[PDB]
Amino acid sequence: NSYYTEENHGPFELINIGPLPLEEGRCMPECLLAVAVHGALNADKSNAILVPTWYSGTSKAMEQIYIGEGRALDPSKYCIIVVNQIGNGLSSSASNTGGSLAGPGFANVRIGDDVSAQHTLLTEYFGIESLALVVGGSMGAQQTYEWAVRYPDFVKRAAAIAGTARNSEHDFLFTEILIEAITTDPAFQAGLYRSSSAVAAGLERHAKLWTLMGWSPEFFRTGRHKALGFESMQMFVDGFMKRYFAPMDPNNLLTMAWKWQRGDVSRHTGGDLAKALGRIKAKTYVMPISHDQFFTVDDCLSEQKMIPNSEFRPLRSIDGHLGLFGTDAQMLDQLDAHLAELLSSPA
Template sequence: MVDNGSVGIVETKHWRFAEPPNTLELRSGAMIGPVDVAYETYGELSPERDNAVLICHALSGDAHVAGRHGPDERKGGWWDVMVGPGKGIDTDRYFVICSNCIGGCKGSTGPSSTNPKTGRPYALDFPMVTIQDMVRVQHALVTEHLGLERLLCVTGGSMGGMQVLQWAIDYPEMVVSAVPIASCARLSAQGIAFDEVGRQAIYSDPSWNDGDYYGGEPPKRGLAVARMIGHITYLSDSSMRAKFGRNLQDREEVGYDFGPPDFQVESYLRYKGGSFVERFDANSYLYITKAMDYFDLRADYGSLINAFRNVQSRFLVVSYSGDWLFPTYQSKELVRALQANGVVTTFCELESEYGHDAFLLQDEQLSQAIREFLRHTHNVVRRTDPSEE
C-alpha cells in the first residue's frame, strides 16, 4: 500500500560507532561511546554518488522524515509534504538521509540510553551535546557508514537549520549546497527565555526527580507545559486567530469554572501537550533545548563573517514573514555574512500567516524553491564533475 507521492513503507535503521575502546569526544570535552545512530534513507544513490541530500531535524523531530513505518501508521514522517516522488525533495532524483540527533530519544544515543558504565539509563550523567556534536555524529554516519564523500545538499528548518550552517562550516569540502530554513546563527534572548521556561516547567515536576525517573513515572505534566509553551511560539498571532479565534470548545457559553477548556485554543494546547509526552523524553527535551541555546556562531568564530570564511557551499536561505521565533532579520544576518565571503547565496522570505512551523506545512512556495535550487545545483555538479568531462 503505497500512498500517492509517498516513499511508501520505510524503516528506521541503526548504526553503532565509537565502540570501546573508541569513544567520541564531544565539544564539552566529555567522552562518550558507544554511540547509536537511528537513520532512514529514501531513494537511490546515483552511480556518480552525487545526489545525496541530508535532512537535519528540529527539536522534536526524528529520523522518520517521510513515508510510513507500516500501513497502520496514521501520520507519515514529519516532512512527508516535502520528501517523496515528485515532491520538493524528489526521491526519484535524490538519495535522502536523515538521522535522529545525539541527545534525542528516537533511537540515537541520548539521556534515556543505557550508560555502559552503570548498566542504567544515563539520565543527567549524559554529557551535554551541542549542535556541532550532532553534526559530527551525522558526519560519521554519512562518511564511515554510508561511504559518501559529498552531499549534494544539507537542509533543515529551525534547529535543523543550525546544523546546516555547522555542516557548511565544519565540512566545507563535503557540502555542495546548504538550505537553512527558518534558522539563525544564534538563538535570541527571547528564544533562550522560552527554552528556559520550558525547562523550568520540567524541573518543577516532582516526577522529574533530577532526571532520574526512568523505570518510574516520567515528568509528564512538566513536559506537557513545556510543549504547550513551545507550540505557541511555533504558531503566530494571525494563524491562531484564523485557526481558533475565540471559538468555544463544545459549549455555547463559557463555563465560569476551571474544568473543561472554555476555548478551542485551550483544548488544542492541552491535546498537543498531552500527546507529546507519550512520544518524547523529558530529559532529551532539556538536552536539545540547551544545545539550541548554546549555538552561537558569532561567539565561536569571533564574527559571523569569520564563521563562514571557509564555506564552499552554495546557499539558499529561507525565512517566513510570520515567524517571530526565528524572525527574518536573523536569516538576513546569515545572508549578509555569507555574501561578505563571496558565497553564492539566494535569499527567500516566504510570505506566510503561519509562524515558525510554516516550513512543516504543505507549501508549494517552499517545495518549488527547494526543487529548483536542488535541480540547478545538481546540474552544476554534473557539469563540473571531472568524471563527466
Template structure:
C-alpha cells in the same frame, strides 16, 4: 519493526570534553546512491522530531525525490533513537547525560556520510528549525563538500531571546514534583504538558491565534487547542531527551568551535555553498531579520521568507500552502 538503521560510532569525545561511550547514530535513507556518489541530500531532524517527521518533504515528484536523489536523514542526538539519555547506559543515563552541541551532531553525521557510504560531495543539506542550524553548520564545517544548503525556519546562531524561551521550557518541565533531578520513576507528565504550554505562543504567530487558524485543524476554541494539542504534544517523548535537545539548541552557534573560535561573521563568510535561506515571515523563535543579517555575511546566499501566519511552524509540513512553497523553491534551487 524498526524502519531505520544504526551506525555505531564507538566512544565519542564531545565538545564538552566528556567521552560518550558506545555512541550511536540512527538514520534512514531513501533512494539509491548513484555510481558517482554525488546525488546526496542530507536532511537532519529537529527538536522533538524523528526521521519520520521529515518525510512530508520526500517523495516522487517532490524536490526531495528518491527516484533522483539518495536522501539521508540522521536523527539528532537526544531524540530517543540516536544516543540519548533514555537509551544510554550508566554513568551517562537519564539526568547524567552530557551536553551535546550542534557541532557534535554534524561532526558525527559527517562520519556517517563519509565512512559508512564513502561520500565526498553533497548536493544539498536541508533542514528546519534545529535541523536548519545543523544545515548551516554543515556549510561552515565542510565548505568543500557541500554544494548547496537550504535552511528554513532556523538561524546559524541561537539568539538570546530564543535561548530564554528554550530555558523556560526546561524550567517548566523541571518544576514537576516528580522530576527528581532527571531520575524520575515515571515520566513527569504535568511538566511535559507545561512545556507544551510554554511552546504554544512561540510556535505560531500572533495572527494565527487572533484569527483562530487552529480551527482549520478541528479545534473549536483556543482552550480546546491548548488542552487537546499542546498539553499532549510532548507526552510521547522522554523528558530528559527533550531537555538534551533544548540544551543543544540553546548553545547553537556555527562559530562555537576551534575552526572559528566564536567569530560568527567569519563562520558565515566561510559558507561558500549556494544557500537558500527561508525563514517564516512571522517566526518568533528565529525571526527573519536574523536570517537577513546572516545572508548579508554569506557570499552565495539568497534570502526568501515563507509568507505565512503559521509562525515557526510554517516549516513543519502541517500547512499545505507553506509546504508547497518550500517544496517548489527547493525544486528551483536544485535545478539551478
C-alpha cells in the same frame, strides 16, 4: 520506552560509528545514529542529500512531510539520508544509554557533535565525499549552517529553513524558560523519574509555552486552529499540543534544549560570525518563516548578508514556526518551488 520505537518512527537502522569525543570534554564509548535512507546512490555518489531532525522530532516527521516522489526531495532522483539527532530518543540518548550516561548522567551534546557524527557516518559507511544538498528546519537548520562552515568543501548546496547560524539571546531565554517548565515539576526528581508520564505537569506546561511562541497571534485570530478541527484554544492546547509532548522523555528534551541554546557556528572563529559565514562555499538559500516568533525574519536576513552568493527567500505563512509540521499546504508549495530551483542551480 514505548514511544521511541519502530512501530511509530520506522523505518530506520541503527549504525555504530564508534567512540565520539564531545566538545564538552566527555567521551561517549559508543555512538549510535538512527538513520533513515530513502532512494539509492548513483555511480559516483553525487546525488546524496542530508536531512537533520529538529527539536523533539524524529526522522519519521521529515519523511511524512517533505520527502516524496512528487516533491523537491525526490527519492527516485536523490539518495535522501535522514539522520536523527543525538539525544532524540532514537539515536544515542539519555533514555536508551546505560552506564554513567544513563538519564541525567548523559553528557552535554552540542551541534558540532552531531555534524561530527554525521560526517563519520557518511564517509565510513556510505563512502560519500560530497553532499548535493544539506536541508533542515529549526535545529536542523542550525546543523545545516554548521555543516556548511565546518566542512565547506563537502557541502555543495545548503537550505536553512526557519533557523539561524548563531542563536540569539532572546531565543536563548525562550529555551531556558522551556527547560524550567519541566524542572519546576517535583515529579522530575532531577531526572531520576521512573516514567516520563509521571512528569506530566512539566510536560503540559511545556506544551502551553510552545503554543504561545510556536505559532502566531494571527494564527489564533483568524481561527486557523478551528480549521484544523479544534473548537477552541483550550481544546487546541489539549488535543494537539499536549497530545504531542505527553509521551516524550523529559531528559531527552532537556538534552536537545541545551544543544539548541548554544547553536553557534562562530565558535570556529572565536565569536567572529562574519568571518565564519564567509567560509561557506555552498549555494545557500536562507528561508525563514514570515510569522516566526523567535527565529524572526530580521534575524535570518542579518545573517544572509554575510553569506557569499546566497539568497534570501522567506516563506509566507501565518502558522509561524510550527508551520514546519505541514499544517500549511500553501507554505509547503513555496518550499518545493524554492528547493527545486536550488537543486537546479549549478555548484
